[PDB]
Design a protein around this ligand. Structure first.
Ligand code: HEC
Ligand code: HEM
Ligand code: HEM
Ligand code: HEM
Lengths: 62, 64, 43, 379, 81, 106, 241, 55, 32, 109, 54, 48
């Protein structure tokens, strides 16, 4: 036997609220980045070449 | 160039044909009885609508 | 509404009118300074 | 006690109205509008103060100023469109609030009801002046025609409309006044809100059943802090959905046109919150008759306590009022519609019967229905 | 004064509750919702929906007329005559 | 002269109760009243049985409301069983106070 | 009291929640405004800040903004020694001041296009269906020369010269300049110009939509757990005796 | 006793006169300005426009 | 008294891990 | 209690911090600065709201605006100078307030 | 704070906004001040409790 | 000045008329402005 993923997570990070909070701070960080990355990608995909990011070429450095 | 073709097409559909008959009688009724207060504008206002609904959807795929 | 109305109450109303009556006069005086009616000024 | 943080500071005890307070168990989702109500008051304020961090209150500039907030200033666009849209929400929320009070008889709390009413009307003033700050064609005219609608009063009116405006028209003088009162109302209103809360804390929150819950009471902290946070979450959702996807949708007015005093949008009308008020004025031929009836629209609220006829403060058990409650709401929707309508036959005749329906529903129908239901229950 | 020890007086009632960590927060939600949602909506619909329905008719008719009377520029009185 | 109309009303009354939430809830009609100063005193006048009953009923009721659950069809308050138990108590309280006013008036 | 015709929900790249602005359209459109439209209508809140918005480089728009200050330059603003260079300058006012503007167009006053798509009720649809909508006056109707008949003007008559006509201008790439094709590009530059924040907002909205949805789901679950105990609890009355 | 009441009354009257003036001053500034009110009632123009139009 | 009456079953409400009477609460509790 | 206006409304009770409250007997004139401090805040406020009824917040105008408040507006001159002078008072008063609790140990609180 | 490199418009509107809203925030603090001070009453010249003479 | 300087309203009107005839609103931007007005402020020595 081993602790369910949650039980593992629990005893390592959620017993102590100091840890818990630390987690959340960390998480908030990591999460913001992934979300953005993913969620920006997703949104740019839906407008391929519609956005200046796609279109800079034409008049850039000759 | 683009706009002008699509418009025509749109008025070639059975519902555009059908409601243009009101325009045709309008115009003649009014022109012949010219003193009347009858507005031919009002009659045109139905045609235009149906022409334009159509125009929009098609007209768009042709521009840049 | 109905409960408030009473045969007994009249003395209070009479008393109130004077105090109320006196109070009413003050407003006219108070309003008048702000209002500045030429006619009021003439009075 | 020792080191019970809460009652140690006396101040921090006063905050235990949030955490420790008796809150009924049963409680529709409707009550989250109180809290959200505050939410909106705080959001407008933070937003307002930043916009009023880059806004100018002159004829010349005001339009420009707003225009500049939405263009050159960093994240000024959302702040402004968040502020505009918010106020919609603020009102959408307000009218849920009063619905609930109407329906479950929360208005029994007369003193709380009377503050509410003041609240409602104060915000109403706020919203009317803010919309004029940007000084655009809709704003410009809307102020004239509302303000002037005050000149109906026979003896004074006329003089008085001219004092409010600071002159004969609505030039700079008026424009800076609204800027100042818009700014200071919300602060005054917060005091009111808290005063409102004060009174309500003395008898706690009514329920859908309509009976005391003292026999069922729950921790506000444990339960109602998450509910409220959740409420937010949906509230914000709506505010950003609006603000991000359809910024102008709910802001009927398309008049982004700098106000030209000879020019007129033949279709002059207040916003959605004030749409009902404009409609009420229209059904009466006479000016003065329309102003009285406009005031009575809103001011009729404070009567309802006295109108209450049933033995069940809860409409929940009285079908018939649940039907006329809904109708009033749908009559209210009907009236809002008229507001954006040409003032012509079709709409006139409709509005007029809706304005009678509204006052019947409130003054005469409901009260009778109350009685009836009481008599069918043998009460 | 004090809001928790002073609310009311309650004799002879037992309550039994469980801890969050022992239970599930989503109790056959689809199954309860459908039947509960269904059962209250159907007890609401009759009391709520009517007046809205009404407004819709009035909206519909009310706009038709307008467009007519105004688009029917000849509506009031005919042309020929 | 009420034989047919009142008869319809009697039938209507059952429907009204059925229409009313309290019957559906299972709580008594008397219990539902807006707790004001007269109800309050009546309330206080209740025997332990009557009165503890009204506490459980409302307990069970606000519990349901909190969970948006309706009671089973088998366990509902039937109109034919209109315990107007507050009515007796509530009447007097009013009766006393109406008098009080009469004595106060004259 | 004349019926007003209303604009189609014309197929736009951006009609949709996530859809965004097509800069090439913007670009094109721009020129349209600048050649077709700068003559009588102004755009005051628009600076020469297309750069990233319009994919015109900084050098590109600097240059584009330089010639506009060389010909129309700050001599019309009040800068006596002004010539080419500057980028803070706003699009050049067709005329010194409004009153003039009405004289040039005989009583009428060319509306600032800055906000026109947003400004006119009915959005870019109306703007497109106005420009592209020009039909023959209706039997028995009279028209003062200025009063051209347009199927979509409130009062059923507008003081507008040939807004746009085929081959009015020419675009760099080679986009077929049809009356309509140009209108599709002109509107778009207006919509982008009218609501600069909105273009950014749609992208933000997508991010906001996902976060709000995720947050809402957790809260319902988080909310349920805290309130679970009251809901879970069943209280049974116990007889006194 | 009358003297005491009279003394209190006298103080109030002095305050009221000041209060009326002070209150009036605050109200007066808000109601109108001689900026605006300079242009009010003062208007003339003629003979510069067509024998036909409307300005 | 209290001893006479059995508490109402929470098996439906109770989580599957903690559902079994035989199963130890402590093992389930860390996971729960 | 019945008809004791004060405690009837809960709100009105809250206001009996002015009327019924225990106040020390002996008490220098210095204390009057607390109250006065609050009169000053109210004064400033009403004044401000009337000034900000005719002020503008731009480089170009501001100066003018104030200048217009003191010339063409009716009784705006005193309102503005009352405003300016007020704030001096507001401070003079504040520094009496602090001196009194620096002296008498009020800062013990 | 300045909303730029100097003190131009930017800064002057900001001050107007903050000046207007600080005194309204201040009023709540004053009332919070009075709140606390109502829990122990006002000190005196003598420095001694006056509960014996109130 | 009227009351402030004892110049009548006719007196200052006149006094203010000639100043608008010579320095007039042509320095302010009122192309066709001449004698008459009283809301005009003292004439700026120079354009700017
Ligand atoms: C030749 C000068 C001229 C040009 C070029 C011109 N307009 Fe106009 N436009 C006018 C005038 C004059 C009016 C006023 C119409 C009226 O008041 O009847 C007008 C009116 C409008 C309106 C009507 C809005 C309303 O309801 O009042 C729109 C929209 C508009 N212009 C947009 C445009 C756009 C977009 C372009 C370029 C693609 C353009 N205009 C080009 C002169 C011009
Ligand atoms: C609920 C109270 C308030 C409501 C209902 C409200 C509503 C409004 C509305 C409807 C507008 C018009 C915006 C537009 O459509 O362009 C507006 C503008 C404005 N408001 Fe608010 N507002 C409130 C509070 C405030 C506060 C507290 C401030 C300052 C702290 C403020 C400052 C402004 C400013 C400067 C503008 C002008 C620029 C613009 O149009 O954004 N408002 N307000
Ligand atoms: C500035 C606007 C307002 C705010 C921020 C606000 C806020 C709140 C909040 C947070 C609650 C508690 C929850 C609830 O019952 O929904 C509440 C309750 C209440 N409000 Fe408001 N409110 C406002 C306007 C009004 C108005 C205009 C009135 C009536 C005229 C009013 C009357 C009431 C009443 C009677 C209750 C108690 C109902 C009950 O639970 O029995 N409110 N308010
Ligand atoms: C906006 C400014 C202020 C207002 C409106 C205000 C208001 C008041 C009032 C009304 C009282 C009661 C009467 C009195 O003792 O004079 C008081 C007392 C007091 N205030 Fe202030 N206050 C202000 C600023 C301050 C400052 C700047 C301090 C010190 C840093 C302060 C500290 C105190 C203390 C310690 C007392 C109690 C002294 C005692 O009575 O034994 N206050 N305040």
């Amino acid at each position: 036997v081993a602790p369910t993923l949650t039980a593992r997570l629990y005893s390592l990070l959620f017993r102590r609220t100091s840890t818990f909070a630390l987690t959340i701070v960390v998480g908030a960080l990591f999460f913001e980045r992934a979300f953005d990355q993913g969620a920006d990608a997703i949104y740019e995909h839906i407008n391929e070449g519609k956005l200046w990011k796609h279109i800079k070429h034409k008049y850039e450095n000759k | 160039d683009p706009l002008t073709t699509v418009r025509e097409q749109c008025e070639q559909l059975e519902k555009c044909v059908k409601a243009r008959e009101r325009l045709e009688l309008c115009d003649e009724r009014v022109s012949s009885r010219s003193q009347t207060e009858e507005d031919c504008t009002e009659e045109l206002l139905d045609f235009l609508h149906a022409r334009d609904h159509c125009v929009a959807h098609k007209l768009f795929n042709s521009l840049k | 509404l109905t409960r408030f109305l009473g045969p007994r109450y009249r003395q209070l109303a009479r008393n109130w009118v004077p105090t109320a009556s006196l109070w009413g006069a003050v407003g006219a005086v108070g309003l008048v300074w702000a209002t500045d009616w030429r006619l009021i000024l003439d009075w | 006690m020792t080191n019970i943080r809460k009652s140690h500071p006396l101040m921090k005890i006063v905050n235990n109205a949030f955490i420790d307070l008796p809150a009924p168990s049963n409680i529709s989702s409707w009550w989250n509008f109180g809290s959200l109500l505050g939410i909106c008051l705080i959001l407008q304020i933070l937003t307002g103060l930043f916009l009023a961090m880059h806004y100018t209150s002159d004829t010349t500039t005001a339009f420009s100023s707003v225009t500049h907030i939405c263009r050159d200033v960093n994240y000024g666009w959302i702040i402004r469109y968040m502020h505009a849209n918010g106020a919609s929400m603020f009102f959408i929320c307000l009218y849920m609030h009063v619905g609930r009070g109407l329906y479950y008889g929360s208005y029994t709390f007369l003193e709380t009801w009377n503050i509410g009413v003041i609240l409602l009307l104060t915000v109403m003033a706020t919203a009317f002046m803010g919309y004029v700050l940007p000084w655009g064609q809709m704003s410009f005219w809307g102020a004239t025609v509302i303000t002037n609608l005050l000149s109906a009063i026979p003896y004074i009116g006329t003089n008085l409309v001219e004092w409010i405006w600071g002159g004969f028209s609505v030039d700079k003088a008026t424009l800076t006044r609204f800027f100042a009162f818009h700014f200071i109302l919300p602060f005054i209103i917060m005091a009111i809100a808290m005063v409102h809360l004060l009174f309500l804390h003395e008898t706690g929150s009514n329920n859908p059943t309509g009976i005391s819950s003292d026999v069922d009471k729950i921790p506000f902290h444990p339960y109602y802090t998450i509910k409220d946070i959740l409420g937010a979450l949906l509230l914000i959702l709506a505010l950003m959905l609006l603000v991000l996807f359809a910024p102008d949708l709910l802001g009927d007015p398309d008049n982004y046109t700098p106000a030209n005093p000879l020019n007129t949008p033949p279709h002059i009308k207040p916003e959605w919150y004030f749409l009902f008020a404009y409609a009420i004025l229209r059904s009466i031929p006479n000016k003065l008759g329309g102003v009285l009836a406009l005031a009575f629209s809103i001011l009729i609220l404070a009567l309802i306590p006295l109108l209450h006829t049933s033995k069940q403060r809860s409409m929940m058990f009285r079908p018939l009022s649940q039907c006329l409650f809904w109708a009033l709401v749908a009559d209210l929707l009907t009236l809002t519609w008229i507001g954006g309508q040409p003032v012509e036959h079709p709409y006139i005749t409709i509005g007029q019967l809706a304005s009678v329906l509204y006052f019947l529903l409130i003054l005469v129908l409901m009260p009778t229905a109350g009685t009836i239901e009481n008599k069918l229950l043998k009460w | 004064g004090r809001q928790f020890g002073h609310l009311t007086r309650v004799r002879h009632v037992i309550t039994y509750s469980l801890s969050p960590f022992e239970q599930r927060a989503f109790p056959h939600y689809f199954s309860k919702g459908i039947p509960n949602v269904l059962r209250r909506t159907r007890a609401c619909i009759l009391r709520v929906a009517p007046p809205f329905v009404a407004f819709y008719l009035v909206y519909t008719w009310g706009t038709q007329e307008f467009e007519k009377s105004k688009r029917k520029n000849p509506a009031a009185y005919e042309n020929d005559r | 002269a009420v034989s047919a109309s009142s008869r319809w009303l009697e039938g209507i009354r059952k429907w009204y109760y059925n229409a009313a939430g309290f019957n559906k809830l299972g709580l008594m009609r008397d219990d539902t009243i807006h707790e004001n100063d007269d109800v309050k005193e009546a309330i206080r006048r209740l025997p332990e049985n009557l009165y503890d009953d009204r506490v459980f009923r409302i307990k069970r009721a606000l519990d349901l409301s909190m969970r948006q659950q309706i009671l089973p069809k088998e366990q509902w308050t039937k109109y034919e069983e209109d315990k107007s138990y507050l009515e007796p108590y509530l009447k007097e309280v009013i009766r006393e106070r109406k008098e009080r006013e009469e004595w106060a008036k004259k | 009291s004349d019926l007003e015709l209303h604009p189609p929900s014309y197929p736009w790249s951006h009609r949709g929640l996530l859809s965004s602005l097509d800069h090439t359209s913007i670009r094109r459109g721009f020129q349209v405004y600048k050649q077709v439209c700068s003559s009588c209508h102004s755009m005051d809140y628009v600076a020469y800040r297309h750069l990233v918005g319009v994919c015109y480089t900084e050098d590109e728009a600097k240059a584009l903004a330089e010639e506009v200050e060389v010909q129309d330059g700050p001599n019309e603003d009040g800068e006596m020694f002004m010539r080419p260079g500057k980028l803070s300058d706003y699009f050049p006012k067709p005329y010194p001041n409004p009153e003039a503007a009405r004289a040039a167009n005989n009583g009428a006053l060319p509306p600032d296009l800055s906000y026109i798509v947003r400004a006119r009720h009915g959005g870019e649809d109306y703007v497109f269906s106005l420009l592209t909508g020009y039909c023959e006056p209706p039997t028995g109707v009279s028209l003062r020369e200025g009063l051209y008949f347009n199927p979509y003007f409130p009062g059923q008559a507008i003081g507008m010269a040939p807004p746009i006509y085929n081959e009015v201008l020419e675009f760099d790439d080679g986009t077929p300049a049809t009356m309509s094709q140009v209108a599709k590009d002109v509107c778009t530059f207006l919509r982008w110009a009218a609501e600069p924040e909105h273009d950014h907002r749609k992208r933000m909205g997508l991010k906001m939509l996902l976060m709000m949805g995720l947050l809402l789901p957790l809260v319902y679950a988080m909310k349920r757990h805290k309130w679970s105990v009251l809901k879970s609890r069943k209280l049974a009355y116990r007889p006194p005796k | 006793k009358g003297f005491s009441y009279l003394v209190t009354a006298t103080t109030t009257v002095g305050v009221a006169y000041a209060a009326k003036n002070v209150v009036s001053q605050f109200v007066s500034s808000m109601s109108a300005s001689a900026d605006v009110l300079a242009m009010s009632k003062i208007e003339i123009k003629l003979s510069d426009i067509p024998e036909g139009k409307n300005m | 008294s209290h001893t006479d009456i059995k508490v109402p079953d929470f098996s439906d409400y109770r989580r599957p891990e903690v559902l079994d009477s035989t199963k130890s609460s402590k093992e389930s509790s860390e996971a729960r």
